[PDB]
């Protein structure tokens, strides 16, 4: 009952930046989002973060080998075995040390990575094959690198932005680009967001090999809303998809969007998060993903996180549960996943 589970994703943000190593406290400053119905910044001082919570570890930076030493041992904690790690397409040599850093700590504690393909600029079927081949040929050989049955396997984040007549041609075995028999094929799991009518043609028309859901508010989407989760899984089934849902303990992002609050989902003291890991343990699915290790602009997060009150921002915290209980509650339900599979 502790071992790492491997049908388990949590995703993972590798954007954190302190003055000491990186320059910048990156991400702990943060512009502050213009309401799409100034707004300044979030300077990113120790008393004024990007964050409605506060990190147990500080203002970290994520090139920091000892702060990735202590997340991998978060990670065997929650019982995580799959970190989803955020992808930029930066094309900068401080993101290729991120990567190579981060899949050696994991190795060390028999973590896997897989890529979470983000909406990157001009974002496209071709770069994204060029880019699928180029993180297979780096990192394909490491030790850590996430394999599911022989196949890496990739998330794409607002996968919607592309059209299924483009995927079509990476991802069917007829398109023109295609990746399937080759050395470069991997199981795309793209965003399942609206009502059925839209994402099963989607899904399907893309060639998708699954699905998941992303958001940690319930309700924010259809797909993230739980009840529909028995639904999407049959539906899964009978057309050979994997159904990764998402869930996560709570949402609040007002810090960085102030006009946001409506997403707000309070943690309740961890039933929240009960709540949801319940609903996709119920319904049947093969894998799960967690919204997330580290997002904490958006306030998902199962890292650890401390009370703080500064001159500038009196923070959350996890009231009466302890800095480390999302991990072990994580490590709670990975168990009864396990029982369930
Ligand atoms: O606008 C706030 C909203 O922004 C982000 O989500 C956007 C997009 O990435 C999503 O695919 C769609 C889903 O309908 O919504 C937005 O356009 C997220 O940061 C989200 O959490 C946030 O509420
Ligand atoms: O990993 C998928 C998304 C997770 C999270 N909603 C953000 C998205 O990133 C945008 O918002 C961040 C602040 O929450 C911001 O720092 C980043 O620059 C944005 O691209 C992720 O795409």
């Given at each position: ?27 702990w ?12 910044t979030?300077?990113?001082?120790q008393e004024?973060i ?20 202590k ?5 065997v ?13 930066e ?15 994991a ?10 393909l ?8 071709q ?45 069917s ?55 529909n ?11 050979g ?5 998402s ?6 992002d ?5 006009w946001?609050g ?45 009370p ?22 994580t ?9 369930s599979?």
């Amino acid at each position: 009952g502790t071992e790492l589970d491997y049908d388990t994703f949590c995703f993972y943000y590798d954007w954190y930046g302190s003055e000491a190593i990186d320059g910048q406290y990156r991400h702990w400053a943060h512009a502050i989002a213009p309401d799409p119905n100034n707004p300044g910044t979030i300077p990113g001082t120790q008393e004024s973060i990007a964050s409605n919570f506060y990190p147990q570890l500080g203002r970290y930076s994520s090139s920091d080998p000892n702060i990735l030493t202590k997340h991998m041992d978060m990670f065997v904690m929650a019982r995580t075995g799959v970190l989803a790690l955020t992808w930029w397409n930066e094309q900068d040599e401080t993101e290729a040390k991120r990567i190579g850093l981060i899949l050696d700590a994991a190795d060390k504690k028999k973590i896997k990575v897989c890529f979470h393909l983000e909406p990157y600029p001009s974002r496209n079927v071709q770069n994204l094959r060029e880019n699928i081949v180029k993180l297979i040929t780096r990192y394909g050989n490491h030790p850590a690198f996430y394999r599911k049955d022989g196949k890496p396997l990739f998330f794409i984040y607002d996968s919607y932005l592309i059209e299924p007549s483009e995927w079509e041609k990476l991802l069917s075995p007829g398109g023109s680009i295609t990746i399937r028999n080759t050395a470069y094929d991997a199981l795309m799991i793209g965003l399942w967001t609206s009502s059925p009518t839209v994402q099963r043609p989607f899904i399907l028309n893309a060639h998708f090999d699954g699905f998941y859901t992303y958001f940690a508010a319930t309700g924010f989407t259809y797909g993230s809303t739980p009840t529909n989760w028995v639904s999407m899984q049959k539906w899964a089934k009978e057309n050979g998809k994997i159904f990764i849902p998402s869930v996560g303990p709570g949402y609040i992002d007002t810090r960085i969007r102030p006009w946001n609050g409506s997403v707000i989902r309070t943690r309740t003291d961890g039933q929240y998060y009960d709540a949801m890991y319940r609903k996709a343990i119920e319904a049947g699915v093969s894998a799960i993903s967690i919204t997330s290790f580290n997002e904490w602009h958006e306030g998902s997060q199962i890292e650890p996180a401390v009370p703080y009150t500064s001159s500038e921002f009196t923070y959350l915290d996890y009231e009466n549960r302890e800095p480390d209980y999302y991990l072990t509650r994580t490590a709670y339900w990975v168990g009864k996943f396990r029982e369930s599979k």
